[PDB]
């Protein structure tokens, strides 16, 4: 089977400098694995697990 956390479209290209920090470009469809602290959440996009701030993803359809 396959599980899922949530979803949130992107809006800005986040410059990733740290590891856990999931990097993503403007307007994107990342796979939100879950909520991490309201201001951030789990991010798994392209065989890579990290995280990102919800501020860069006002979401479109979860």
């Amino acid at each position: 089977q396959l599980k899922k956390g949530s979803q949130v479209e992107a809006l800005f290209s986040y410059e990733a400098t740290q590891p856990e920090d999931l990097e993503f470009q403007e307007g994107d469809i990342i796979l939100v694995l879950s909520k991490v602290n309201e201001e951030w959440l789990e991010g798994e996009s392209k065989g890579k697990v990290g995280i990102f701030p919800k501020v860069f993803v006002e979401d479109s359809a979860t």
């Binding site: 809006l11 800005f12 290209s13 986040y14 856990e20 991490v36 789990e42 701030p53 501020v55």
Partner: protein, 32 residues
Amino acid sequence: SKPQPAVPPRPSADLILNRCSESTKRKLASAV
């Protein structure tokens, strides 16, 4: 053209360790 939001001090690795997958946790795994 849009000025992205100055990213804030991402959640404490630990709370992430509390709300993330073992994968992302590997990135932090520092806690506290």
